[PDB]
């Protein structure tokens, strides 16, 4: 009656894990001599990419078990590492530093942040030495001894050696598109209310993901995607407090950041072909770095987040926002890098609200040059100073939060900003993507018989 008929090219797939390859704009590669996140390891992108709607297809997605996020983590860290191998290693700079206060033009907030430090340094000739001065930040220098000798050491020098970023290499995140090799497909959830888990009734297949900028930040997702309809609350388990809650804004909050100091860059020769760039002298008055957010915009977005949180924690629960309990500087402050300078902003103003069931904010930011990226101990880098005044505009497109546990009373829920792991920063963009394996061989009954 019925016989086996073999079909090749059937639209059947299974969940799979593969090694994806990027796609990037060749244009920006011509504009960008080098970018830490290499466009050379990657490939030029294809204009007019294709997205086919898989009508009548409902696919199961898991934002919290996605290997695209892990591959992105591996790729970004490895791209950073190879972008920092050729650059100069600042081992000769691990010397005693005689440091004194800088009080030329200082406001009461910036008192003691910068120090004038003198030290003996190597020169291009191995038989001669020089005494050179540079300004250093309090966060990059540690007292050598308890006694007030005013002798200082760089924080890394005990545990590790600190590389210097090449001055030519740029830090601007450029979009990268993650593409699937032959025999694999990327399925994109087109549902506008999806929380990253469970069945997705609106699915499409894409050659490559949308351009994702590797923006490294804590407590606030910058320059990311925005929710189409409503603020999106996404946690692996919302009841669990050990899992960070990722918030997506439907409307961004514009944030204006600046370091008003007019900085200079001083070349110091430490070897035959090796240079060390230093802070030089700050032309003009010295004022603290800070960031401005619109207060009304922040309050309206916070109300929207409160409404979405109430959808998960009760209709009469009190949603309180408070600031970080503690930890390293990266997590306790809104850490980010824009222009090549690494900022650290106190977001206590941002999270200072109790929401009962019924003009700008200025954030004092701090600057550092010794940066330990990606929660690794022993691989610090020195950020060369950026010359001039830096002004900086970004969109706050989301939050990373942690809910306080052990609540004695059940009417309130406290949420504090968090971060530090960028797998939860890059999972807020890849939440709607899953890679699948095509199984093109099928066998089905038909009445047809081989002669």
């Amino acid at each position: 009656n019925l016989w086996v008929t073999v079909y090749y090219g059937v639209p059947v797939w299974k969940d799979a894990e593969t090694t994806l390859f990027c796609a990037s704009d060749a244009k920006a590669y011509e504009t960008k001599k080098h970018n830490v996140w290499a466009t050379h390891a990657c490939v030029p992108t294809d204009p007019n990419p294709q997205e086919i709607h898989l009508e009548n297809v409902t696919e199961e997605f898991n934002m919290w078990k996605n290997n695209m996020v892990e591959q992105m983590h591996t790729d970004i860290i490895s791209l950073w590492d190879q972008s920092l191998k050729p650059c100069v290693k600042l081992t000769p700079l691990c010397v005693t530093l005689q440091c004194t206060n800088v009080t030329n033009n200082i406001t009461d907030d910036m008192r003691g942040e910068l120090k004038n430090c003198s030290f003996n340094m190597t020169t291009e000739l191995r038989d001669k030495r020089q005494k050179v001065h540079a300004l250093f930040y309090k966060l990059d220098i540690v007292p050598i001894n308890e006694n007030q000798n005013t002798s200082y050491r760089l924080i890394n020098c005990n545990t590790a050696a600190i590389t210097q970023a090449c001055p030519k290499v740029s830090f601007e995140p450029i979009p990268i598109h993650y593409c699937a090799p032959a025999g694999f497909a990327i399925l994109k959830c087109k549902d506008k209310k999806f929380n990253g888990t469970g069945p997705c009734p609106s699915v499409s297949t894409v050659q490559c993901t949308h351009g994702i900028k590797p923006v490294v930040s804590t407590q606030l997702l910058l320059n990311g995607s925005l929710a189409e309809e409503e603020v999106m609350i996404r946690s692996k388990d919302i009841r669990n407090n050990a899992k960070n809650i990722l918030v997506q804004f439907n409307t961004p909050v514009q944030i204006n950041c600046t370091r008003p100091n007019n900085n200079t860059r001083k070349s110091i020769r430490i070897g035959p072909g090796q240079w060390f760039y230093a802070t030089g002298d700050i032309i003009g008055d010295i004022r603290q770095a800070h960031c401005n957010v619109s207060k009304a915009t922040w309050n309206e977005t916070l109300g929207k987040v409160v409404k979405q949180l109430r959808k998960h924690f009760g209709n009469n629960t009190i949603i309180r926002f408070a600031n970080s309990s503690g930890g390293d500087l990266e997590v306790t402050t809104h850490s980010f890098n824009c222009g090549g300078e690494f900022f650290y902003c106190d977001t206590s103003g941002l999270f200072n609200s109790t929401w009962i069931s019924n003009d700008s904010i200025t954030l004092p930011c701090r600057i550092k040059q010794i940066i330990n990226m990606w929660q690794r101990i022993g691989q610090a880098m020195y950020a060369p100073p950026i010359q001039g005044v830096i002004r900086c505009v970004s969109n706050i497109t989301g939050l990373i939060l942690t809910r306080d546990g052990g609540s004695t009373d059940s009417t309130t829920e406290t949420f504090r900003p968090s971060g530090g792991d960028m797998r939860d920063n890059w999972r807020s963009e890849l939440y709607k993507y899953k890679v699948v394996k095509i199984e093109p061989l099928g066998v089905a009954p038909t009445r047809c018989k081989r002669r």
Partner: antibody, heavy 122, light 104 residues
Framework: VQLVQSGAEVKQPGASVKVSCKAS????????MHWVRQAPGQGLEWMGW????????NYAQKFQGRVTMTRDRSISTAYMELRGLRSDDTAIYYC????????????????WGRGTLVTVSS | VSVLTQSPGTLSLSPGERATLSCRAS???????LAWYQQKPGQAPRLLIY???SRATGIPDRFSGSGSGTDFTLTISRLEPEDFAVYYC?????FGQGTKVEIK
């Protein structure tokens, strides 16, 4: 796989105690570290956790303001400092490492610490 | 947090018979997230059940448990002499009051 804590100690009201928890055998950065309170003749009582990789701690509302947990990654040791001590704070303080289950429900304390009694007296 | 009530306060049996210790979660949504801990006197707790039903590595098969939603139970099949302790149920950060299994 072992967590050795500090020795038992006696303190006055108003002082500050700092229990510690050295870890051996497992990668200290991969797991969270929780601090749990067993008062005498009472049930277990969770206080907080700390992420070793970041240092970001979560506290219980009763211990908010009075407890500070820290870590030193180099020596794979965690600390919990209960300031502003009082009479009811007399209890054994364990350090617990949740195990790596399949659902990432990191609340299954397979590895506890032996304990460190803090006796508050006048 | 989630309230856990672990009844009965004190349960008096004798060796070799089956005891059925129960925990009831109140302020939850209902899932398979529970653990059973054994704490002998003078010792720190020890994990027996990791999940609604699964068993921690190394624990004998006499210790078994089940449940779902908001009602769970620990079933000690054989009350061997090294099985008398305080048993606790854990839902995330919350802990039960404690059940005493005492010889009688």
């Amino acid at each position: 796989v072992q967590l050795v804590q500090s020795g038992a100690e006696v303190k006055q009201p108003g002082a500050s105690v700092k229990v510690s928890c050295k870890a051996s055998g497992y990668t200290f950065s991969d797991h969270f570290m929780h601090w749990v309170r067993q008062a005498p003749g009472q049930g277990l009582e969770w206080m907080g956790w700390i992420n070793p990789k970041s240092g970001g701690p979560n506290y219980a509302q009763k211990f908010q303001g009075r407890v500070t947990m820290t870590r030193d990654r180099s020596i794979s040791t965690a600390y919990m400092e209960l300031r502003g001590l009082r009479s009811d704070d007399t209890a054994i303080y364990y350090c617990a490492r949740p195990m790596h289950d399949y659902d990432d429900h990191d609340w299954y304390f397979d590895l506890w610490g032996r304990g460190t009694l803090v006796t508050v007296s006048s | 947090v989630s309230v856990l009530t672990q009844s009965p306060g004190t349960l008096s049996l004798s060796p070799g018979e089956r005891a059925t210790l129960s925990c009831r979660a109140s302020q939850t949504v209902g899932s398979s997230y529970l653990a059973w801990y054994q704490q002998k006197p003078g010792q720190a707790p020890r994990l027996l059940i990791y999940g609604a039903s699964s068993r921690a590595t190394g624990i004998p098969d006499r210790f078994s448990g089940s449940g779902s939603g908001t009602d769970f139970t620990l079933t000690i099949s054989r009350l061997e002499p090294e099985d008398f302790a305080v048993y606790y149920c854990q839902q995330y950060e919350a802990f039960g009051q404690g059940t005493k299994v005492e010889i009688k």
